[PDB]
């Protein structure tokens, strides 16, 4: 689905931005766009799960992954708002493990 692809690309491009950021505002802005992308992608049905039921275990698993991902973005956003550039970057790298094991397999 087009919207879902754009939100997923926004999530992954803005991860790259975070690692090469030099200040806190850079990190916070990237996390801002990841959060708004994750809020939309959270609601979508990935194409591999189009036929599934919305209460299927795969859709439950897809939605729980984005709950974790949104929780992780919020943790990193808390660190960026305190000025802790490096800790916010370390908290951003945590998203990669959730992305692979939970969400990427369904896209």
Author numbering: 0 to 106
Text taken from the publication that reported this structure:
Previous studies showed that proper introduction of disulfide bonds could stabilize the flexible region of target proteins and reduce the conformational entropy by locking the protein into single desired conformation. Here we developed a comprehensive disulfide bond prediction algorithm that not just increased the success rate of predictions but also improved the quality of crystallized target proteins. We applied our method on two proteins which were previously determined to high resolution and frequently used as fusion partners for GPCR crystallization, cytochrome b562 (BRIL) and Flavodoxin, and verified our prediction by solving the crystal structures of the wild type (WT) proteins and mutants. The theoretical and experimental results both indicated that with relatively lower values of conformational entropy, proteins would be more stable and readily crystallized to higher diffraction resolution.
The continued disulfide omitted electron densities of the side chains suggested that the disulfide bonds are successfully formed in all crystallized mutants, which are T9C-A36C, A20C-Q25C, V16C-A29C, and K27C-A79C in BRIL and N14C-C93, A43C-L74C, and C102-R125C in Flavodoxin, respectively. In contrast, the other disulfide bond (A20C-Q25C) locates at the edges of helices I and II. On the other hand, the V16C-A29C and A20C-Q25C in BRIL, the N14C-C93 and A43C-L74C in Flavodoxin have higher entropy than that of WT counterparts, consistent with their relatively lower diffraction resolutions. For BRIL proteins, the simulation B-factors are consistent with the experimental values. Furthermore, our results indicate that the conformational entropy and protein stability are sensitive to the location of the engineered disulfide bonds.
